[PDB]
Design a protein around this ligand. Sequence first.
Ligand SMILES: Nc1ncnc2c1ncn2[C@@H]1O[C@H](COP(=O)(O)OP(=O)(O)OP(=O)(O)O)[C@@H](O)[C@H]1O
Ligand SMILES: Nc1ncnc2c1ncn2[C@@H]1O[C@H](COP(=O)(O)OP(=O)(O)OP(=O)(O)O)[C@@H](O)[C@H]1O
Ligand SMILES: Nc1ncnc2c1ncn2[C@@H]1O[C@H](COP(=O)(O)OP(=O)(O)OP(=O)(O)O)[C@@H](O)[C@H]1O
Ligand SMILES: [Mg+2]
Ligand SMILES: [Mg+2]
Ligand SMILES: [Mg+2]
Ligand SMILES: [Mg+2]
Ligand SMILES: [Mg+2]
Ligand SMILES: [Mg+2]
Lengths: 482, 487, 479, 480
Amino acid sequence: MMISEDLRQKVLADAALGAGNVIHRLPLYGRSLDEEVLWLDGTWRAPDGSRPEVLTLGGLHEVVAEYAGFYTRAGVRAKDAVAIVSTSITDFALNLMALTGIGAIASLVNANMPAETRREYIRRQRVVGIMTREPWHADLLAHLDDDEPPLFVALQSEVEPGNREHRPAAYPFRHAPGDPILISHSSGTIPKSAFHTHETLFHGALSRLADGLDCSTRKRLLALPGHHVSAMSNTLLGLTLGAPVVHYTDPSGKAVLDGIEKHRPTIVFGFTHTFTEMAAETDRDLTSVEAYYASGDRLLDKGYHTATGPDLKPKKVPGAIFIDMFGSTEMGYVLFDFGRCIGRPMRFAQAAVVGEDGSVLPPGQVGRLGVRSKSLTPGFWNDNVRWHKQWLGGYFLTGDLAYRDAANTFYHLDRTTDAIRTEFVYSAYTEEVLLREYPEILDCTVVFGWDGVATVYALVAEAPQPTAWINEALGRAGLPRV
Amino acid sequence: MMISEDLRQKVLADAALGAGNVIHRLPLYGRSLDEEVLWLDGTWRAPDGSRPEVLTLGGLHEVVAEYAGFYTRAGVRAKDAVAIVSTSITDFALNLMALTGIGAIASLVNANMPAETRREYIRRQRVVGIMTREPWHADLLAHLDDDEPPLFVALQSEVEPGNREHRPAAYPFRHAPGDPILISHSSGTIPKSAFHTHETLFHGALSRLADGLDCSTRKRLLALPGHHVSAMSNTLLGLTLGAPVVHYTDPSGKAVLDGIEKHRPTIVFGFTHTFTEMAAEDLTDRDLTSVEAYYASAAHAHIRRLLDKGYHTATGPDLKPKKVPGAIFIDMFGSTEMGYVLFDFIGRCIGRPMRFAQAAVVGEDGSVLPPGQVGRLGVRSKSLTPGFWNDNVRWHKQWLGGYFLTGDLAYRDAANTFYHLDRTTDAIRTEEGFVYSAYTEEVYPLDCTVVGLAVEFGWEDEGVATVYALVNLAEANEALGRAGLVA
Amino acid sequence: MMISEDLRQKVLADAALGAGNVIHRLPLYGRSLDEEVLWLDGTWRAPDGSRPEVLTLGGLHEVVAEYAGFYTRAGVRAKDAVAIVSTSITDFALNLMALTGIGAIASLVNANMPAETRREYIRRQRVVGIMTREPWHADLLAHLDDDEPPLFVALQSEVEPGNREHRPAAYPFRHAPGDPILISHSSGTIPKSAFHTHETLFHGALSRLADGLDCSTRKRLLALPGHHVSAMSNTLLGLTLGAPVVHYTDPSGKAVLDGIEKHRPTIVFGFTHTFTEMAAEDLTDRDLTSVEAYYADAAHAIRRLLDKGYHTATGPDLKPKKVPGAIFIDMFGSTEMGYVLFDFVIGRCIGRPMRFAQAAVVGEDGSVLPPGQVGRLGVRSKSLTPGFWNDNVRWHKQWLGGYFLTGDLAYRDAANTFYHLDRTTDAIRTEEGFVYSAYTEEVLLYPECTVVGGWEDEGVATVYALVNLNEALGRAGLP
Amino acid sequence: MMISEDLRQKVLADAALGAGNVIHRLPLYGRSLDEEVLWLDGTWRAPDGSRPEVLTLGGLHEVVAEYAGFYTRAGVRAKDAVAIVSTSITDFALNLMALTGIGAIASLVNANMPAETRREYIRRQRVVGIMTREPWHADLLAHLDDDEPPLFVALQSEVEPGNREHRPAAYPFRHAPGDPILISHSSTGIPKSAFHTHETLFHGALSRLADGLDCSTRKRLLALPGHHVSAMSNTLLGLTLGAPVVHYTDPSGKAVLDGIEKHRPTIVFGFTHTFTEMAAEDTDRDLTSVEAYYASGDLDKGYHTATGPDLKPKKVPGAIFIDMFGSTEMGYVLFDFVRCIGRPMRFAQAAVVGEDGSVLPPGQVGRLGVRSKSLTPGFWNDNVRWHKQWLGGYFLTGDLAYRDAANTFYHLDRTTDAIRTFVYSAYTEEVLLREYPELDCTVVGFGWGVATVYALVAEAPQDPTAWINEALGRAGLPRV
Ligand SMILES: Nc1ncnc2c1ncn2[C@@H]1O[C@H](COP(=O)(O)OP(=O)(O)OP(=O)(O)O)[C@@H](O)[C@H]1O
Ligand SMILES: Nc1ncnc2c1ncn2[C@@H]1O[C@H](COP(=O)(O)OP(=O)(O)OP(=O)(O)O)[C@@H](O)[C@H]1O
Ligand SMILES: Nc1ncnc2c1ncn2[C@@H]1O[C@H](COP(=O)(O)OP(=O)(O)OP(=O)(O)O)[C@@H](O)[C@H]1O
Ligand SMILES: [Mg+2]
Ligand SMILES: [Mg+2]
Ligand SMILES: [Mg+2]
Ligand SMILES: [Mg+2]
Ligand SMILES: [Mg+2]
Ligand SMILES: [Mg+2]
């Protein structure tokens, strides 16, 4: 369902509400502190020592209050950065609600980040403290010998019942629109660190709630990367809408086929890989799901979805929705909803297929995807050098090459770094045609860029004799050939 | 083709630019005065006595100067309203350009307005002046017996070579964003008076251009009704773009077929009534291939006959341009209150809200409705009218829940795509639910009218009725059955 | 004393709050219904037949509920304008709360508007209803012969205990920022009808409060004309701040000197004439020590009243220091202004523009003039009226250069301090220069007046002084 | 004089105008490239080897196009930062006008910054190249051994006639509102490096022009610190209004008295000190040209126009003294008064903030805080000290103050300088320099733990402590 007129107006009239104070406002809207709101997978160990399967609004306020005082006692003050090295969406979200209540910044770090690289990334942030769990803690104590070290490398088990008494007197913190609440990192291709504020992280959400969109009470299962800006924006968003949120730390398509069947969620958030794993695996009940929300680089037919019939009345079409979202850590929210089509920019965002001089390119020509929005990061942490340089012509270059039609429908063709000059070859597009001409094809990778010419070569039941096989798909379709 | 970056940046850097100074600014961008800007129907008598078929930047700037001065000598001062009573896109355009230079307001009035209604409509505006032509001038002198009478009921022929000497010394005016430039009117259903400002009438154009949209140089044939804000909006806009504009006073399908063949426009603005007329013609060896887009502005429209005689550029799998058969059809959603289109694309799909616009399906209390639920179409946009000339009573009554009600009932898919069902007034209640006459009508491939009859049965009116289908056509409710959905 | 951080943050975090729902928000901030909020002066008769001397938040919400219902039963609907014809800040203030609750607009009309003009002023608003009292009701029935006649001409006595049941179910209305709440009218010089919205009428108040200004809890005595927009905003604003508001229907110097003694207010709002009169009394056995600020108006004015007071200052110890005499703020306003745009020698200093306002001295082509040059005062603000009701003709004609001409001529110093000289219409051209009547009157006022004899008309003239009781002109430097 | 209606409208209708395109737009408004626009003190060497005494618009555009190509050839690309290490307002301004058109950031560094610290400041910034002059260059070549080194530590003589050909084809650069143009630095610890953009650096200026303020054609003499945000805004501002700008690199009260006598300027910009030293000089000096002195940081021989009772102008004696409150991070001045700081200017919002950040009531003492789109968007490469400088939604300026009911602020002290007993040092100091005409005072002492205050300042006293203390007693303050 969609939220009531009552909650919408309460939300849109709360000039204070933002990513940094979401749970402390929910009581004031009238929610009961006994209601169940956030459903856990079992990985998360509570301070009393338990492993809760569900938290209520009040329980989450005391879990968050517990971690909060532990930090304020360990010495965390406002505007202080805390590096959080875990892999549990539940881990990051609770530390962010706590650290935000004390006015601090929860710098989320995926523990699996390549080790020698994680050290430079955390080192560069100058955080006053690290918090982690037992699997990575022994290595993170190296950071205590950093020129400017963290005050502490702690474990979550160090947060014990009653630590909340040390929480500050003016709790919770009163955020200003611009007060940082988070720092996230890029995924691969020295990760770039972007910080997010009380306002930018919820700018897209509320902008959508205001148009009458993305404002359902439907149960959502969040099996996203736990460190990623969206896992936090959707755990924060669902709680705000009153939508039962469910955290799954298992990215396996098979664990999410259990989760879909166990929790029977109406919508399911994950990355493309997760939905793929799900797609390869008849006797599964995916009846509850009406929409899959994906993001990053055929389970649909086992579902259903509501539409408007010619009677101008609801219909229960068969199959669920697959929504390919285009996002980044630095993009804050999603800026588009739908070659490979990304869709039209949403009303609180501006988009351009930019040129090398930065001039908006006309429709149909290929260029750098560029965007603008107050949902966007205000900058790279401690690194003004790289940031101002990732902008061209007034747009934030997202790092992808694309083109657009007259409606401003955009299509991702390739990564800028991945396009090849060959007397040009956008590989993600080139890859996709092959998986579409030759169904048998499970995977493809097409290999002088945006510098000089080169040559391109494929990487894909039976086999061919090779080039001649693939090169027939390209010829029919009209593309340069390997 | 798209305008150059050099021009785009100049427009987007011209904080001064708006609906009220378009022609006074193009020179400053580098436009040559010798250059041609405007192609005419041959129906306009110029001050020289001529009926020129094309005006240059410099000559329009000349002809505008004359009307401008003629007005300044008749006593028109800044912020004054002047009714233009005509039936010619071209007349409305030249008086509008002129009044704006002296700081004045051109109240467009369709002369074909019923007389006593048109008399009521102008009387309410309290204008200092009417300018019309001989077809209506004799009747318009009645307004000289209004309690607050216009200073003059003039004729266009009265504007003579050399009248420009009387225009003011600071010509051209220096408009404020909020300065009225124009007043438009609705179509019965007394019309409402929407006033548009130097900002509202250009907020939508410039916003889109900023995104790299609706900003091509292609030759446009504007056979729109001259008195609509849409006719003036696109006229001015093309001038701004460097796009060849072509005014046609004859909206007939045969007339426009000639213009398409004569001028070979890339895009054509007209009303559904015009595009339908064209589609009922041989069109065997009519060359309508120049056109890639037909732009409409309730007539619902065989149009596919016309589209198929065209082409449209697309991006193929070679990732390079590709000529494709058939031209585009854009049914834009428009009203007086909207100085641009707000929507871009089961039901007449109106489109998706445009970045500078906000749209909602609203309940009777003004509560945003969920998708699939049927309500009143509502909007918000800095392109909208700031209000009805001399009528805050009617203006405010049109706002519900914070949205401006367009008078049309609708629903929107979960993608925020809006689909028109009916005008709020035309819908019939039955003991089995609501019947939307516009949806039934367009729902057995001449005319239809799903009227109904019985009592009060309207969106607001509680009380049921029964529906009846009135079919034109000839060898005379089972099609209703063929798709969901009369006695 | 300043409002608490807890209230400030609640107000500043309340995206919904505006002139049209001030009381409906106060509870949600935590105010008690039992608390007293509005102190009246015995002129107003309540629905149950009383003449209460104070109202509580809960009881004001009850009185407003009744008027609202009575109107909702008479047929008044949302975006429907209703003329309120009275002379009482309390009448207007109460009808204004009720109409907003149903989403309607209240057109404040001062009954003492000359009849033949007052009829034209109401006719030009096409209201669905008039509400008034016995003094004027029989005459106001002429509007029943208007071509578009009000649905009803009612008396306030018709509002009976229990009419509140008829109010709408969704009471109270939910205002949009742009939703009209109020119409005010100009003195005359037909008056212009300026309409104010849920947003504009509080746009200034809220701007000021964000800054930590114009936000004290001090008790305030409003002896302003009830029909002026500022009389309603200052009422509305005081309730918002939690400050005891006190309505006085009598603007006479005696009545207000009595009120100051009875209620011992910290600040007093009135028109200049009110304050001049108080200054002419004995002021010997009077007690005006409570007052630290007089808030005032083409009438000039009174150091007697000020010396009977005090004002807190910062001493060289960096600590509070009560000092003799109370403050006088000679504020500049019009119907169109909404809030005050200027925060207060050669001329009547107008003050400095406030953060949410822009002011300019413009020429006849609308150009910005330099400091020291004389021109027409012009302004811009989100507090200003968005237009004249049913008069776009008159409205657009008051703008020059992007600015709203306030109808006055002025100059400003290099500090963008503006000084009023005269109303554009009162200035006299002469073979030797321009003469500003308000400045000249002021200068002359030898402590023992009217300078007469145009700004747009190129004709020269001669000027003459009329006293009631040219060497003084020379002394000060004038012609 | 005020600028014309024509320039005002032209400027206010240039949505492209900002700090990074100031001279490239001035031709478009209709200025002649033959006009003289910028007056120099003689200490500047031109590419040809000349030391010009005045530059024209086109001459500025050629000298600017020169450095641009030398920089564009040396390998500087857009959004790239260049540390400029000098002491000359002319040095910094010419390099900033140039880099801006190449799209690069002119990171202004005062060469006299303590040495080992100016090393750590430049090394943190990670610049692509250094530019300096012979007096300091030999030391700046050390930065070539830093972990992430500069492409070039170059000298200004390396920019030679004809380098302008190497400028890019798309020149000048098209700035976006948020594109960086400058990095300036503070003056109580490792200086903070604040970056400024094409919109923030010029936001106050144009906001004032819009209200009809700070828009004169009057000749102005800029003897400000060459590296300071001020010295750049008034230069760009002077060029924009059409006012003859004049650079004096000598901050001595005597050198400006020579400058005010030689150039007869209408207004004079400097820091508090230059005007003070100037006060101890002379009588037989002609400062009649001057009607206003503009100061920042930390008279009877002139005239000023006022409005007389005839409502006609009146040349009064003595020039105006305007004590402005600004900082590198504040971008523009946010307060004006003619220690009263004045009222915030319309484009600025200010508060005396508590320790919880709550707007304090009038009369109580707190941290000075402000908000404006003129403010810097952050400290270069340092999002850690940046957010920590904000409290309650405000940017703490570093000063303690209080305000009256009009929002007139009075600076009392720097926050670091107030001693608990509480005694605001700058206020106490001035109190004593007013009871006793004397030289200069400095009150020391537990800051914002208790302490005891002591003093530091023609006859001499026996009990200097008995003395000073009667001033305080009468005045009403804690005693030393
Ligand atoms: N694309 C469209 N699809 C459906 N209806 C449309 C479309 N464009 C316009 N309309 C119709 O045209 C109307 C706009 O007409 P206009 O504003 O000129 O006057 P009116 O609405 O007929 O008269 P009145 O304003 O008195 O009600 C819309 O309200 C709608 O009914
Ligand atoms: N502080 C003040 N000093 C001097 N005059 C003031 C001051 N405040 C208000 N006024 C005068 O009061 C006027 C306010 O206008 P108001 O709306 O009350 O009616 P009006 O202007 O007299 O009527 P009309 O608009 O019909 O001429 C100002 O234009 C100005 O002349
Ligand atoms: N008008 C003024 N009155 C009093 N003090 C002022 C005034 N203007 C500036 N100051 C003082 O000088 C400072 C101006 O900033 P500046 O650019 O000199 O760097 P800074 O503040 O000295 O930096 P840091 O203290 O971090 O080294 C203000 O912070 C304030 O302490
Ligand atoms: Mg990736
Ligand atoms: Mg990237
Ligand atoms: Mg309509
Ligand atoms: Mg009392
Ligand atoms: Mg007035
Ligand atoms: Mg400092």
